[PDB]
């Protein structure tokens, strides 16, 4: 119907006006007085080797000691960062993997890819034994990210523009989130684990609520595909990190982008994003085999993490924040400090 | 009538929102990250004492054994001839694979690992990069006369960097069905009449040249061409010829004798 299109345009115009009136002083103005962080220097400690192919993901554990890797190798090595010991090395039926997760309790891991399944494995459930527990099928389109919010629940992005939620015990999908037009590319659960954000290839992230399964808010300030998003510590913001070569820090309660992290020399896209313990420092990976730290309040660079020859395809900070880890297409996983 | 009628309902759900604006939200971010600045190891160096940078010695043994089988597991993958066939989805994929759904095939001391992705959505820009390093693509566009969407994929891969060195093989499938279809209806009905002829030899060339139009046809990535039929016996033989040629070429390039 013609009116529905015109109605959509009119309500979109009014939504921006509601946003436009809300923005009185951009984030940079009030935070001008605070002393910048200053150039920080973190040098690698551990180059965890063992993968024979570019590694596409990784994840930490609440203990802040055990890692996970996923790579086209076809393996899912679980490391001990403190000693670089390959605690586990799981194979799987389909070599191709694009994500991996580590259960917050530490008894499970999940790893999906270009097969439309997020298969869970009973990591250290039986001594010297680990096997495929569940296979969550029925999720059309490739699978791009899985996350645990409890022992029995998984939120998974997909290639078919969906973020279904699962019940591992029954292996049946409970609540599905829809509304994205381009395939979803990342997740980030809130600390309270009632809300989560999903950036997709429609240049628009959306805020979902786990309980009632509705889209609370839609954010759009980007110019290309959104690749990897992290969720601000306090719970009222999240960075974006798109192929636009820039990170934008949005904030809930305002429905607007607070700041933009971009420099004219950075010419490539972004494939990973993370925050720090206090959230002050933003860490983002790039296609130019270079992760550089960002000042989340000042939008100025604060260091580089050049330790790879190929794209930095993943990175994460420990739950306690004492360390950082980056993986890359060069097939080596690095642990910084 | 109902494709975005749900979206307009959604946008109203985003409208009646109690919003605390930037002149309290920057303080919200400012207040949290200043009160928690004392506990951030990266923002502030954590004391040197707390920074660390029986079963374990056994674990050092597990790592070696785990790291041992990785080399052996990589042995098979090292000798594997990786392939993929796009074919724009619907095509003569059944016959060719018969002679992600990854089948397998071994011949003359090699281990082919054919990869077929027809179960994905049309937008493949965020996962096609996984196939960088495949030995060669195998196009098998059938002349069942999607034809158009197949050509557009040819444009993308032939002009991308990840596939700049991976050779491309092109197959024309279902020759019997194609000839039966075109013995009455000419190609010029839907294409320009540059063909000027209705046969099976020129038509195969006329379909080919459209593909040749969009390529660089470099001395390295020259396409391979052998129209194939479901009642033929030389399809796999020509695939083998092309693949062994590509392997020899990669070897020579490695030797610097290319």
């Amino acid at each position: 119907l013609d009116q529905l299109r015109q109605e959509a345009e009119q309500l979109k115009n009014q939504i921006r006006d509601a946003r436009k009136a809300c923005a009185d002083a951009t984030l940079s103005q009030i935070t001008n007085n605070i002393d910048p962080v200053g150039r920080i220097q973190m040098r690698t400690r551990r180059t965890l080797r063992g993968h024979l192919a570019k590694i596409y993901a990784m994840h930490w554990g609440t203990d802040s000691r055990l890692l996970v890797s996923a790579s086209q190798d076809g393996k899912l090595i679980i490391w001990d960062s403190y000693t670089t010991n390959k605690v586990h090395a799981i194979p799987l039926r389909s070599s191709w993997v694009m994500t991996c997760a580590y259960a917050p309790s530490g008894n499970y891991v999940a790893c999906g890819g270009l097969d439309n399944i997020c298969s869970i494995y009973n990591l250290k459930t039986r001594e010297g034994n680990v096997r495929v527990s569940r296979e969550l099928a029925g999720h059309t389109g490739y699978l791009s990210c899985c996350r645990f919010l409890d022992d029995n629940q998984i939120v998974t992005s997909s290639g078919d523009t969906t973020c279904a939620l699962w019940d591992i015990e029954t292996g049946q999908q409970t609540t599905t989130f829809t509304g994205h037009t381009g395939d979803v590319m990342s997740l980030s659960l809130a600390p309270d684990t009632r809300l989560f954000v999903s950036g997709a290839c429609d240049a628009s992230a959306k805020l979902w609520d786990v309980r009632e399964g509705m889209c609370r808010q839609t954010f759009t300030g980007h110019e290309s595909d959104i690749n990897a998003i992290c969720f601000f510590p306090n719970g009222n913001a999240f960075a974006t990190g798109s192929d636009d070569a820039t990170c934008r820090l949005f904030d809930l309660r305002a429905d607007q982008e607070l700041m933009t992290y971009s420099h004219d020399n950075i010419i490539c896209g972004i494939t990973s994003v993370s925050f720090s313990k206090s959230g002050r420092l933003l860490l983002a990976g790039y296609d130019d085999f270079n992760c550089n730290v960002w000042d989340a309040l000042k939008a100025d660079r604060a260091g580089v993490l050049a330790g790879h020859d190929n794209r930095v395809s993943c990175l994460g900070v420990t739950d306690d924040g004492m360390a950082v880890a980056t993986g890359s297409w060069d097939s080596f996983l690095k642990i910084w400090n | 009538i109902a494709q975005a009628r749900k979206l307009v309902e959604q946008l109203k759900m985003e409208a009646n929102i109690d919003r605390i604006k930037v002149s309290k939200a920057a303080a919200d971010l400012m207040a949290y990250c200043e009160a928690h600045a004392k506990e951030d190891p990266l923002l502030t160096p954590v004391p040197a004492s707390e920074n660390p940078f029986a079963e374990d010695k056994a674990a050092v043994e597990r790592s070696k054994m785990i790291d041992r089988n990785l080399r052996e597991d990589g042995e098979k993958a090292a000798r594997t001839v990786k392939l993929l066939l796009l074919g724009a989805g619907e095509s003569g994929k059944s016959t060719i694979v018969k002679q992600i759904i990854e089948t397998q095939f071994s011949f003359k001391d090699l281990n082919f690992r054919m990869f077929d992705v027809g179960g994905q959505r049309d937008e493949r820009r965020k996962w096609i990069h996984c196939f960088e390093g495949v030995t060669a693509i195998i196009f098998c566009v059938a002349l069942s006369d999607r034809m158009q969407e197949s050509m557009n994929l040819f444009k993308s891969i032939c002009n991308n960097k990840w596939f700049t060195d991976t050779s491309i093989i092109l197959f024309l499938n279902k020759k019997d069905l194609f000839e039966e279809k075109i013995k009455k209806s000419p190609l010029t009905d839907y294409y320009p009449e540059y063909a000027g002829s209705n046969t099976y030899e020129e038509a195969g060339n006329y379909i080919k040249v459209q593909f040749l139009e969009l390529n660089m046809a470099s001395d390295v990535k020259e396409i391979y061409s052998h129209m194939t039929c479901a009642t033929d016996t030389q399809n796999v033989k020509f695939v083998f010829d092309a693949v062994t040629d590509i392997i020899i070429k990669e070897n020579l390039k490695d030797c610097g004798l290319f």
Partner: nanobody
Amino acid sequence: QVQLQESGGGLVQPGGSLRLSCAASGFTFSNYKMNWVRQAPGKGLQWVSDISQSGASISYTGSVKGRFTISRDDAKNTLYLQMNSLKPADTAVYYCARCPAPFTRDCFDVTSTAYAYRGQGTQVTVSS
């Protein structure tokens, strides 16, 4: 919201001339490769023009050679395509497809269904 609005589509007798534009907005229309994809009756989305980022590297399909020209103008922030001596078979809905990756010549899924960076298009028509 990146928007690319087209204009100029209209009826034209065979053998004539016609130029149509694309006033983009929401992004920096200086570092994005761009295309012109048409959707003729009885066919899907086809690829025609391949204006690169610089403006010197431009490609065409065999059906379109020696007749169509494409151009960019950063100052006016618009894309330009022109059809000369067009045949009746140019009876499609020309769309203005921007490519997803800035600063690169990788135009990968511009003709795919439900793509996010091509405007609604103008119903170019050719009568007889």
